Design a protein around this ligand. Sequence first.
Ligand SMILES: O=c1ccn([C@@H]2O[C@H](COP(=O)(O)OP(=O)(O)O)[C@@H](O)[C@H]2O)c(=O)[nH]1
Ligand SMILES: [Mn+2]
Length: 521
Amino acid sequence: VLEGAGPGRLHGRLGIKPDGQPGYTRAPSPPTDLSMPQALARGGGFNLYLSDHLELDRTAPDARHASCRQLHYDLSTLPKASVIIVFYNEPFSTLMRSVHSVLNGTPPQILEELILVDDGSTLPYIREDGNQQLVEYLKLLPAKVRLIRNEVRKGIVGARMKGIRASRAPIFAILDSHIEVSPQWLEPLLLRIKEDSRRVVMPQIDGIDAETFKHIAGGCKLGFLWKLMEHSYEGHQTARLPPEERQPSPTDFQTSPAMAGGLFAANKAFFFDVGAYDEDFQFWGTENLELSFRLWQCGGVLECAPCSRVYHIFRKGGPGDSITINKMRTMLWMDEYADLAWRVIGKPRVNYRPESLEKRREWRKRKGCKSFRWFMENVFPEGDVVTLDDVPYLGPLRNDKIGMCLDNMGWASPGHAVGLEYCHGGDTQTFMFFRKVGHVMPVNDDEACLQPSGRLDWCRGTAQFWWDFTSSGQLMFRETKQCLSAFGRKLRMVECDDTDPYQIWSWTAYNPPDTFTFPSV
Ligand SMILES: O=c1ccn([C@@H]2O[C@H](COP(=O)(O)OP(=O)(O)O)[C@@H](O)[C@H]2O)c(=O)[nH]1
Ligand SMILES: [Mn+2]
């Protein structure tokens, strides 16, 4: 039951005790002699001295465009929804604030429940063998709110699964454990899925500083890099969209090849029929790109909602064998393109659970999921590699005259010079070519682009990174029409003369198979 309800306290006044004083004892203002690096250290990314001093009913600004406030929903016609917050060792202030923001900002008749999932927390206030601070504080919240636990820590997929299974409503929404909503955040999501159950709709994300906690606005279309992480459409990538979509209205829903994180809503039935999540994914990793490829390919639709805004606390501080498994398993959905991605993350040989993954290959064909080439040709044709014929060359860039190859000289990360070293055949000495934008990059970072300076730097789809690889073997920078020379084991730009053997290179052609055979375990 809701006691004292009203605008901004849609579920009533939360956290009050029998005697009327609040059930949370807020903290004093952070000390004046307060070293920010130590505070983010002891807070796991946040300034917890401040969060503990801020109110759990903190009032946030409306990050929604003005046109979003001019819409009217009918809360009787909308399907109830289960919000699912999953947390591992989230502090009390941030966690309880996220919950307050949801209950205060979600009409109760469209919020079936609010499920808090303990993914094996090891803190006294969240542990069943300790303070019991969380358990006792929950008794001061609506009945909608129920806690459930994982015996041990199962990770992102494992805990969202425990949470989604427990839901009751037709629709479930997933929220982080360190967030604040803007008003009317859930109404747009319910309305969009009511009209088509196949749609997974995600809110657009604003920020909360992890040092000052100032609210900050934020950015819909998202692609992916061949290192297998989401990547917001670069400027030259929106320029390929149709004109009618290059600059979309701030109230319209627009699609997205990928989802950035795990803040989305979906119909529980459709979600379970479209594959749900790969429960052999380990801890935190590439689940976002494997749920995104699978959704689109198996008759789904992914779009963001500019009228559905949620604030998130991006951190400023703090396994490894897990992120490479999640990536190999994501390649199932990439078909022949998995060769390229496999090479970019370093030809990794791991135990990707080949048994369960073959039962995901069976499931994939039983549903008749569309190919990854379908994906690239119809969902992400703005990308730079829509077919593997767009990667004409992958291998060493060798200069026969001096008998040396290029070398990232250690790392592929942007911002450091390239060198000429004796050829040894390792990935450090392998480079790829993207022809749609003329990018000479190290195979291990498709965000790193060679420049006439001889230095790698961040890739931009522009003329300052465009290279032509001529048929004589030259690396001609398009804007100056000068060619690259290895003279004196130094890299300088010179006049183009196909008779100059110091500027003529050899680059391995890239003709991968039509099917990718996974690397043995
Ligand atoms: O084992 C885990 C890993 C993550 N999460 C939650 O999943 C969400 C996304 O993870 P997080 O934001 O911590 O990842 P990050 O971006 O910090 O690496 C957050 O609400 C986490 O608390 C969780 O409950 N258990
Ligand atoms: Mn987060």
